[PDB]
Amino acid sequence: AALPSIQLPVDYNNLFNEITDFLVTFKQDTLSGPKYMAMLQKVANRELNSVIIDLDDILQYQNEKFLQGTQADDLVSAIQQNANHFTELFCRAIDNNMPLPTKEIDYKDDVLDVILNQRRLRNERMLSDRELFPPNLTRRYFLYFKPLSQN
Amino acid sequence: AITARKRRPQVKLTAEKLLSDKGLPYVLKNAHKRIRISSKKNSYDNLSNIIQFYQLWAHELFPKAKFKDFMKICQTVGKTDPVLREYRVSLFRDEMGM
Amino acid sequence: LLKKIELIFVNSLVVIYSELEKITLICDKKKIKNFPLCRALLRGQFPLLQKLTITGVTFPMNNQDIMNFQWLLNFPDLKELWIEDNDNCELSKFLQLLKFSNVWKNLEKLTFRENKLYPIVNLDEDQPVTNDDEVPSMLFYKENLQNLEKLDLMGTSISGSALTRLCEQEYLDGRKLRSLNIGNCPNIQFPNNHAHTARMILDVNAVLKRLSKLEEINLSHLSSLNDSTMKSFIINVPFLENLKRLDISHNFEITGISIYEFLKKFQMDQPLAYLNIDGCSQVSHITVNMIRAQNLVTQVDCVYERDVWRKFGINSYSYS
């Protein structure tokens, strides 16, 4: 079953780069590390699972970038338009950048650690010439977008 | 000049694979280390001490077959293959050469 | 003594070559996760080589010279070049090679077909100067592309403006060129459209005025060729009177209306020789039967159920 295709005014490579830039840079600087990377250290400690994104944070980041003279391609409009896909993009960015834990966890007590460690060992036995997993399996947190305030 | 048509492949225990490193050289590496036989144990357990290693090696070498069927395949390739004969006679020739 | 070689690498398991005149390298993209002749092609020279045909190979990322087509300089006098479904190639790098070297004295034919949608490529008419007190670099696009009889760019993400610039610069001669394929190119829009960035527009009037004596056109799979856009072709019939063979098949938008008014206007030129509208969902049965009955096309193909276009060996050398 062949399909036609069309060009559209978006690029998920560019927006993936924008999303990870926001994630590794932003903080709530009007209230004076990044908010999101610090929160992801809390995730890495297994102290938190509800990852909340504020659209107001995205808007403040866009305004900061536009104030610094570069267009942010209005990620707020994109997430308000095709939100479901940007859950995948945000989660991939987090999975690509989340820092390692600080608090001890007794890491072997999770079955997923043992089973993926065993798969890694088996893959190294193969790799001596004698993805490792789908990322949703390893992804412990839950990601949610929180709406814009009145403005 | 022609687009392909598929045909089902098949795999069977070739003597080359039986002579891979995980083949008989695995037996030579591991059998005398892993099988242990003693008057301290009954006959059933001693037979099991043999059979466990050969079964694990058989499955790790060629997991497809049942152990008895694997053994029949091994006996028959042993009956036939010349390179396998040269290897086996080379084992007892090495023991002669000691 | 080997003049023509054809390697067809269906499966994978694990110096001067003056004799060679034609090289075909067809590779199953699923299996051949490398580029078999890469070291030979980049190191050796094949001076007699008239035709090259490479499909399905994966250009290694680790060697930018391969990605920049630096090897391709090794083959002058290359009358025909076909290069298709080689996943990690790009038209973007290819047009840099066409920019910065007089790489060929003559190509009679070019057929470049990348598979995935790479970013928008535009004809890089930027002519830098080393300094204001020095000459610019001569852009070798014309003397490379001047000779082409057949240009095929199916699926290559080329922007409509890039193709107009090839015509306005007259890098493509227009008289020597006699057949053109730009099917499946998403970055082609037509002047009747309202929702685009302007550099994706293909000014068909400018282009058809440039290359008017061409015999064959292929716009197959070009979803952008809606009925409204076909009105441009209707008003431009006087600038394409050499056209005999037209392929617009596997278009899921083009209604039989545009076919009929195009052919009625074409008939003001003595029917069209050949038309392909296989796989098109909107070409009404009564309309095509009226086309036959009125004999507006000498032959018109309407196999609605034919899902695919890439007849192997005939339309494509990408394997199976």
Swiss-Prot record, chain A:
<protein>
    <recommendedName>
        <fullName>DNA replication licensing factor MCM7</fullName>
    </recommendedName>
</protein>
<comment type="function">
    <text>Acts as a component of the MCM2-7 complex (MCM complex) which is the putative replicative helicase essential for 'once per cell cycle' DNA replication initiation and elongation in eukaryotic cells. Core component of CDC45-MCM-GINS (CMG) helicase, the molecular machine that unwinds template DNA during replication, and around which the replisome is built.</text>
</comment>
<comment type="similarity">
    <text>Belongs to the MCM family.</text>
</comment>
<comment type="subunit">
    <text>Component of the MCM2-7 complex. The complex forms a toroidal hexameric ring with the proposed subunit order MCM2-MCM6-MCM4-MCM7-MCM3-MCM5; loaded onto DNA, forms a head-head double hexamer. Interacts with CSM1 and MCM10.</text>
</comment>
Curated annotation (Swiss-Prot), chain B:
<comment type="function">
    <text>Forms a fork protection complex (FPC) with TOF1 which is required for chromosome segregation during meiosis and DNA damage repair. FPC coordinates leading and lagging strand synthesis and moves with the replication fork. FPC stabilizes replication forks in a configuration that is recognized by replication checkpoint sensors and protects stalled replication forks against the fork-releasing activity of RRM3 helicase.</text>
</comment>
<protein>
    <recommendedName>
        <fullName>Chromosome segregation in meiosis protein 3</fullName>
    </recommendedName>
</protein>
<comment type="subunit">
    <text>Component of the fork protection complex (FPC) consisting of TOF1 and CSM3.</text>
</comment>
<comment type="similarity">
    <text>Belongs to the CSM3 family.</text>
</comment>
Swiss-Prot record, chain C:
<feature type="repeat" description="LRR 3">
    <location>
        <begin position="104"/>
        <end position="127"/>
    </location>
</feature>
<protein>
    <recommendedName>
        <fullName>Protein DIA2</fullName>
    </recommendedName>
</protein>
<comment type="subunit">
    <text>Component of the SCF(DIA2) complex containing CDC53, SKP1, RBX1 and DIA2. Interacts with SKP1.</text>
</comment>
<feature type="repeat" description="LRR 6">
    <location>
        <begin position="211"/>
        <end position="232"/>
    </location>
</feature>
<feature type="repeat" description="LRR 5">
    <location>
        <begin position="174"/>
        <end position="197"/>
    </location>
</feature>
<comment type="similarity">
    <text>Belongs to the DIA2 family.</text>
</comment>
<comment type="function">
    <text>F-box protein component of a SCF (SKP1-CUL1-F-box protein) E3 ubiquitin-protein ligase complex which mediates the ubiquitination and subsequent proteasomal degradation of target proteins. Probably recognizes and binds to phosphorylated target proteins. The SCF(DIA2) complex is specifically involved in the pheromone induced degradation of phosphorylated TEC1. The SCF(DIA2) complex binds to DNA replication origins.</text>
</comment>
<feature type="repeat" description="LRR 7">
    <location>
        <begin position="240"/>
        <end position="264"/>
    </location>
</feature>
<feature type="repeat" description="LRR 2">
    <location>
        <begin position="75"/>
        <end position="100"/>
    </location>
</feature>
<feature type="repeat" description="LRR 4">
    <location>
        <begin position="145"/>
        <end position="169"/>
    </location>
</feature>
<feature type="repeat" description="LRR 1">
    <location>
        <begin position="20"/>
        <end position="44"/>
    </location>
</feature>
